Amino acid sequence: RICFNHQSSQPQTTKTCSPGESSCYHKQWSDFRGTIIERGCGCPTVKPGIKLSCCESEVCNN
Amino acid sequence: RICFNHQSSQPQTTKTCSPGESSCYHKQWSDFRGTIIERGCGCPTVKPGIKLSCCESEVCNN
Incomplete structure (x- = not known):
C-alpha cells in the first residue's frame, strides 16, 4: 500500500x-x-475533536 | 452520529x-x-476494486 504523507497543502x-x-x-x-x-x-x-478519515486503496488520503 | 446517505450528486x-x-x-x-x-x-x-473511506466525525462522509 502507498499512501500520501505530505502535510496540509505542501507538494x-x-x-x-x-x-x-x-x-x-x-x-x-x-x-x-x-x-x-x-x-x-x-x-x-485521535483525541476527540480531531477529524480522522481512514481509507483502503492506493493513495486515497489526499 | 449523523452521516450523509445520499448517492453521488443527489441532494x-x-x-x-x-x-x-x-x-x-x-x-x-x-x-x-x-x-x-x-x-x-x-x-x-467491500469487494476488491471498490474504494472505501470511513470517518469518525459528524457528516464527515460527503
Missing part, C-alpha cells in the same frame, strides 16, 4: 507502507496557521 | 445512526454510467 509526497498495512489516514485540526492536515500509513487513534 | 440527505455508531462511510466505483458514490453509517466490508 504531494508518498510513503510505501509496511507489508500488510492496508490503510491510509487523513487527520485534520486547526492551529494559528489555519487548517492543518496530517497524512500517512495506518489508522491512528 | 444532500442524512441518516441518524444507531446509538454507539461512530463512523460514516464513503464507497466509490466506476461503471458504464459514471462514478457512483454510496454513503451511510458504519464502515462496511
